[PDB]
Amino acid sequence: QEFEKVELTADGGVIKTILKKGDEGEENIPKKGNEVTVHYVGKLESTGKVFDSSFDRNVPFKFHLEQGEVIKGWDICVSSMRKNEKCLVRIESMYGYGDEGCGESIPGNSVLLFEIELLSFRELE
Ligand SMILES: CO[C@H]1C[C@@H]2CC[C@@H](C)[C@@](O)(O2)C(=O)C(=O)N2CCCC[C@H]2C(=O)O[C@H]([C@H](C)C[C@@H]2CC[C@@H](O)[C@H](OC)C2)CC(=O)[C@H](C)/C=C(\C)[C@@H](O)[C@@H](OC)C(=O)[C@H](C)C[C@H](C)/C=C/C=C/C=C/1C
Structure with missing residues (x-):
């Protein structure tokens, strides 16, 4: 295969395609509570x-992993990523904005596609 496709929930709700492989080893995967820095579209x-x-080029996006800050599909995806990994992730509405949707563009029952690049992460004191 050109790219590794990774099903991250058994229900098909979160599926990752690894576009660029990141650094091998557990020490290169972020852990719960870590600040992570990414680019995305x-x-x-x-x-x-x-x-x-807005965060696809020069401006980095930062959040705390698995701390209720982002949609579930993002926590699920980023918790599987290696430093320097670039992936495509397809997120069904159950793991996104559900029935409520978000803002003017994202209705209920939306499937979201993100490209995410994991740049770095750090443990908080
Ligand atoms: C201008 O651009 C927005 C981001 C936009 C909003 C609209 C969506 C289409 C989108 O375009 O991002 C988008 O691409 C998207 O879907 N995102 C952003 C990238 C991460 C994944 C996803 C997401 O979960 O957004 C998030 C989504 C919209 C809302 C959350 C979904 C999960 C749910 O559990 C949360 O309940 C609370 C709400 C937005 C964020 O990633 C920001 C960072 C986080 C929050 C606002 C909350 O966690 C909040 O909770 C108190 C906080 O603790 C924050 C840090 C407090 C500070 C002061 C607020 C910062 C706000 C920054 C807002 C930013 C940069």
Whole structure:
């Protein structure tokens, strides 16, 4: 295969395609509570339109892994990533914004596609 496809929930709700392999070893995978730094771009599957590319180039996005800060599919995806990994992740609505959707562009029952690059992570004191 060109790329490794990784099913991250058994229900098919979160599926990752590894575009660029990251660094081998457990020490290179972020742990719960760590600050992680990424680039990303998000696209809505239904319309095919990119809704967020603000963090896709020079500006990094930071969040705390597995701390209720982001949609579940992001915690599930990033917890599987190796430092320097670039992936495509397809997130069904159960692991995204569910029925509520988000903002003007993302309705209920949306499938989201993100490209995510894991740049770095750190443990908090
Ligand atoms: C301008 O751009 C927005 C991000 C946009 C919003 C709209 C969506 C389409 C999107 O375009 O991102 C997008 O691409 C997206 O879907 N994202 C952002 C990238 C991570 C994955 C996902 C997400 O979960 O967004 C998140 C989603 C929209 C809302 C959360 C979903 C999970 C749920 O459990 C949370 O309940 C609380 C709410 C937004 C975030 O990643 C930001 C960082 C986090 C929060 C706002 C909350 O965690 C909040 O809870 C108190 C916090 O603790 C924060 C740190 C407090 C500080 C002051 C607020 C910072 C706000 C920053 C906002 C930013 C950069």
